[PDB]
Design brief:
Blueprint: E1 8-9, E2 14-18, H1 21-28, E3 32-36, H2 46-54, H3 58-70, E4 78-82, E5 89-93, H4 106-112, E6 119-122, H5 134-144, E7 148-153, H6 156-164
Parallel strand pairs: 2-7, 3-5, 6-7
Antiparallel strand pairs: 1-2, 4-5
The structure holds the ligand Fc1ccccc1[C@H]1CCN(c2ncnc3[nH]ccc23)C1.
PDB class: viral protein
Keywords: Macrodomain, ADP-ribose, SARS-CoV-2, fragment-based drug discovery, viral protein
Assembly: monomeric
Length: 167
């Protein structure tokens, strides 16, 4: 039993809700919140900009030190950093950005990072400003993640479309 409330169950391990991931994280304080990161951990917009804003820029400060030490992530890769006031940990995961020409096949590799964590609150990878089809992202999520994932979808119209079209 966990504290996630109001989710629709899609499969044995995948759950979905129309929710602002920032507000959901503040309420649940999950062990892991996933950020829709880029390789430079520059949290300017989309989910990343919103999560970082909610940390009063502490996420960005921590991220800049991470990059100065380690260099950029790989597309499809991840790193674990602090969750600040939102979660115990933040798993920064880099899905391919279609608006940069990145290979959509890397979306499966990106979701594989979730399997290192028993339970996660997450957005749909590569959706939103990353330019991928969110229906496809949900399909890859369900077919790749084996741990327990609670997906927050900000847009109500998109949420209804994802549910109604789910096979
Ligand atoms: F822009 C993006 C970049 C990368 C991945 C996804 C997006 C879109 C699609 C879903 N998404 C969100 N989902 C849940 N909570 C949210 N809070 C603020 C934004 C947001 C924004």
């Amino acid at each position: 039993v966990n504290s996630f409330s109001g989710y629709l169950k899609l499969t044995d391990n995948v759950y979905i809700k129309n929710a602002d991931i920032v507000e959901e994280a503040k309420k649940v304080k999950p062990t892991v919140v996933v950020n829709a990161a880029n390789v430079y951990l520059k949290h300017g917009g989309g989910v990343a900009g919103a999560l970082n804003k909610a940390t009063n820029n502490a996420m960005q400060v921590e991220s800049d030190d991470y990059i100065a030490t380690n260099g950029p992530l790989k597309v499809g890769g991840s790193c674990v950093l602090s969750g600040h006031n939102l979660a115990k940990h933040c798993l920064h995961v880099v899905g391919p950005n279609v608006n940069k020409g990145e290979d959509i096949q890397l979306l499966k590799s990106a979701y594989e990072n979730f399997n290192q964590h028993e339970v996660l609150l997450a957005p749909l990878l590569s959706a939103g400003i990353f330019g991928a089809d969110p229906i496809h992202s949900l399909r890859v999520c369900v077919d790749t993640v084996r741990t327990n994932v609670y997906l927050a979808v900000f847009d109500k119209n998109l949420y209804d479309k994802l549910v109604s079209s789910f096979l």
